């Protein structure tokens, strides 16, 4: 078994927790929850959503580790 990484928020997907989305261009997106799975379809930007892992990495927030 393996744990996925959410395609939008970057949260860890444990077995079964979330959904899996297959776009027409055959690109697969695994969502940890409806929160990510809905913000995606709203055409929001992960780089702009403040709690997103991409946002955290981009703005370097918490990167002092």
């Amino acid at each position: 078994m393996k744990v996925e990484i959410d395609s939008f928020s970057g949260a860890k997907i444990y077995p079964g927790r979330g959904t899996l989305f297959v776009r027409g261009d055959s690109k697969i997106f695994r969502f940890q929850n409806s929160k990510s799975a809905s913000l995606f379809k709203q055409r929001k930007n992960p780089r702009r959503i403040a709690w997103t892992v991409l946002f955290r990495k981009h703005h370097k927030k918490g990167i002092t580790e």
Binding site: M1, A11, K12, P15, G16, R17, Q32, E65
Partner: protein, 386 residues
Amino acid sequence: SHRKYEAPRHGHLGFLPRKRAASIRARVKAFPKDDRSKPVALTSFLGYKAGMTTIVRDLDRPGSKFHKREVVEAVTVVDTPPVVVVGVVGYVETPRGLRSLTTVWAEHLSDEVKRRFYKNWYKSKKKAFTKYSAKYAQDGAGIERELARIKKYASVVRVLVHTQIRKTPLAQKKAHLAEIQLNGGSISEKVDWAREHFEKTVAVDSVFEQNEMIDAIAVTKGHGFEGVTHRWGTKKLPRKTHRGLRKVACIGAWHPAHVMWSVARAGQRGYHSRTSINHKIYRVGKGDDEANGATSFDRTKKTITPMGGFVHYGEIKNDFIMVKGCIPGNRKRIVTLRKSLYTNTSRKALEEVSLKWIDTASKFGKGRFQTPAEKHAFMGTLKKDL
């Protein structure tokens, strides 16, 4: 005329009447057929359904599309603190049924089982079994001869066992008591075995085994007065129906001039006794054992209790039974666990199950972490973590 197009009956008729159960602890009508060969063992156990949780395991049935591949399954975790034997009742066979001719109690019954006999424990003077425990003196002059009487005239003997309600995280303190048939030796061995176990404890690991095919017997979730559309699942009448549509339309023909019993009618739903058979035990854990929330594949030091504790319940701090699939009754509720009444030599029952991973994530929402250690690792330091 005849019904225009056939259709199945709405709802099973074998469960009528759909009245409230007699008591919150559903009785065990039937017990596994007795043997005189195997060692004396209990045929049941009392637990408190804590809740459900997710698992992943290798399905191991040949010829499956998923043979030797991961499968996600739902399990319900039952809290099972060790029951205490407090008495023994012998049954004689009569041409009118089994009749209990004698109950014999132990010396120092627990306060929590003494509460069972009272409704207003706060102001009661707690005289219960005072003269019985007094009678227990002179090395039980009456008790000894009364056990001999059971041995002389008894066909089936059941022990009275009660749960350590105080060990569970419930707000209750009035322990539940129950009769459990003893299968195993002959009558004398059973009562000798039971006498040895007076005011002594039995835990699950000694009665239930991994991969055993058990039944859950309990009172279902209640829902108060319920209309026919949900009680029986009857078709909803069309939208333009005058005087409501969550109904059944024709409750019977002109003749017989009576509403037939088998016609769906609105009323109580749930809180019925239900027996659900052929459930599989996945893990008989130990409350003393830490890290019972891990497997031979996961190797973490987290317990079975989900993060933030089971919803409405608390934590598991005692022995538990982690059984696949649903069980009747909701959380906090007493459930009865009973060995299967027949040998189940189906391949699905004989599957040798071993778990891979156990979901400890929070049931209280969409928690994304298995343990506070891992949760801390992901998010780093916080304005609160000083």
